[PDB]
Design a protein around this ligand. Structure first.
Ligand SMILES: NCCc1ccc(O)c(-c2c(O)c(O)c3c(c2O)C(=O)c2c(cc(O)c(C(=O)O)c2C(=O)O)C3=O)c1
Ligand SMILES: [Mn+2]
Ligand SMILES: [Mn+2]
Ligand SMILES: [Zn+2]
Ligand SMILES: [Zn+2]
Length: 144
């Protein structure tokens, strides 16, 4: 229904989102850091790594203005969201089984926006945004 931006929205605040979970305890964290100096980290129970990545995106949509840049390192989160947008009101579309409720909450937030840019980056070493939020969500969840 929607058109995600082809390139970052110049001027808009950028949310570097991430999540991490531990399979053995199902504990996890999801959150963001932004280039305007905000951050947020929430602790979650009964969750998975995929669920935490989606939850971080939901948090960024909840806390942002009408134009938002979001940078994720979850290929899954980006793919399931983009596929939802491209295939609604379209033939031959079976909605995914896993995480359907969370993705529906995200799409809810997405359509309320004016412009959204969503990009995937591989996780990497450094001092940039994806690295910072990685350390935040990995604290006490997985070794780094
Ligand atoms: N110092 C460099 C190595 C390093 C150090 C610290 C890190 O935290 C990570 C690291 C992440 O922080 C991270 O969040 C992720 C990964 C990382 O490797 C992934 O690899 C990864 C992630 C999400 C995904 O959805 C996939 C998928 O969907 O397939 C993959 C995939 O591997 O395939 C993902 O979220 C990597
Ligand atoms: Mn990640
Ligand atoms: Mn990461
Ligand atoms: Zn606007
Ligand atoms: Zn970086």
């Amino acid at each position: 229904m929607y058109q995600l931006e082809k390139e970052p929205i110049v001027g808009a605040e950028t949310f570097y989102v991430d999540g991490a979970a531990n399979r053995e305890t199902k504990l996890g964290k999801a959150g963001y850091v932004t280039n305007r100096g905000r951050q947020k980290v929430v602790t979650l129970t009964d969750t998975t790594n995929q669920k935490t990545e989606l939850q971080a995106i939901y948090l960024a949509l909840q806390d942002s203005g009408l134009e938002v840049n979001i940078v994720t390192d979850s290929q899954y989160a980006l793919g399931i969201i983009t596929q939802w947008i491209h295939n609604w009101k379209k033939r031959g579309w079976k909605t995914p089984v896993k995480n359907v409720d969370l993705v529906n909450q995200i799409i809810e937030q997405l359509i309320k926006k004016e412009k959204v840019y969503l990009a995937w980056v591989p996780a990497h070493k450094g001092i940039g945004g994806n690295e910072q939020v990685d350390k935040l969500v990995s604290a006490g969840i997985r070794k780094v």
